[PDB]
């Protein structure tokens, strides 16, 4: 049997290089489940890979069916799978950031598959893994926040807060009882405010460009989802041992990190390298089930027009998360 | 103001020839600092790499630059906030932020990175310790996860370029943790590395050595990788299921290769070692040396008046153990 999918065949083609195809339905390996997809979300790293940001390592092969964040129903399980059976609703992270999400079916490893409770729809779940776990990891590891009421107090800054990672980060930080400052564009100020941010800066204004807290807060940590801001801009806004947590770091961020750690600066730049874990996804899924975290969907698009979604992703102005269905 | 002898370089890329003898003011310690009359200074590869430009434009912070960070000496003046040290104390220290300072008669160290030198540990053997020894110590106790009481279950450890500064401490530290140790070096240094306690020694000029192939067919749980020019592909089939390559003195490429491997979730991992020097760890090392459980091997000693010789020896890469300038 064949399935619809989208793929690209080389670097740099953008949405135009995204091509509709029919490929074999995958067979799960022994530790895998095969999913009939119900929803897939896009992440910026998906088109960055296409652009060549992580060449030659990714993709492993052309052509590449992109996207990793999915939700669907199990239809076949590998010979070593115990926790899942045909008919289970799940959310998963597709493996090794090697795509498979823009298709009708995908295989996920059992380790990166988590049950989807009835109360959580497919789109709102598929939106979670990369963006949500990234936010979750930024705030609980380098920012060191606790999500109950244990937890040290903190001043947190979220740049590009209306985007995928940013909109989860703002919500997560308020659960950790942090004071939250956010930057975004004029159009999204009310929306970010509604996510619970205490202060919202328009990054087009001198104050916003300066990342200057209106109440004069210094930030203990920054969830930095935006681009093009030198450390020098952050530095005077940081507390004594403040950290800039760089989301989706490139080669330059990784080296700047090395030398700063080397030279022992008190104010630190921390790249966030996501390690997705089932427990954390479960945790996030449950927050969404309890309504403690809200998944905001920017737009939905059918697989037959997924190039539209891709283009929306590349253009960078999504509010929340972009969804392709399946 | 009194002057002191020092060596400095004024731009990138000059090598030993660009090293110049000068007289500069003796430093005044800030409130959290001690001023040391130096008795010894050791060189580290990162010292000439910085001069070469490996970390431009971040280092050095200014030209000219008096290089080297690993020192031992006697306190002669303390800043107004210093309590744990007084004039006359013998100490070993790491000079700050890799802004050098060590090829001089006096230097200032922060109290946080200054540790007492016990009588039984000479100045040269202590000055050799900080960067090379703490690097080794951090590689084995954090990503390798070994315990230095030896009761831990037994790892297979590989040390590449084991006759060098970091390598020679790593081999000794790994034997304290009761690991099985495989080491690579040149033909000339095989007996020396064996004497450090390595269980297996490979000549890296032989096909087996180039392949990093354990003679007894061990897979390595961790590699303290002090050598250069070895792709991950060479390590990979010698690694255990979740083995790690701990890259000593990583560059831009290592840091990015690390990111993407972690990102793609490979079970065999490349770990860059970014040294975080701490007083408690230096104390610990100094005490090991005092107890004779770790030996400092000194490659050669040179007077400050001829420190360009030491620098050249460092750049050339064939030191056995640690190179020392006095002061």
Author numbering:
A (entry chain A): 4 to 329
B (entry chain B): 3 to 329
Q: What does the report in the manuscript say about this coordinate set?
A:
The chloroplast envelope Quinone Oxidoreductase Homolog (ceQORH; At4g13010; molecular weight 34,034 Da) from Arabidopsis thaliana is associated to the inner membrane of the chloroplast envelope where it represents 1–2% of the crude envelope proteins. γ-ketols are long-chain reactive electrophile oxylipins and are potentially toxic. The ceQORH monomer is formed of two domains with (i) the catalytic domain including residues from Gly3 to Pro132 and from Leu277 to Pro329 and (ii) the cofactor binding domain (Val133 to Leu276) showing the classical motif of Rossmann fold.
The monomers are very similar with a value of root mean square deviation (rmsd) of 0.25 Å between monomers. Each α-helix in the dimer contributes for 723 Å2 to the buried area, being 60% of the overall buried area at the dimer interface. NADPH is always present in vivo and the dimeric apo-ceQORH probably never forms in cell. The apo-ceQORH monomer was used for searching homolog and comparisons with structures from the PDB using PDBefold.
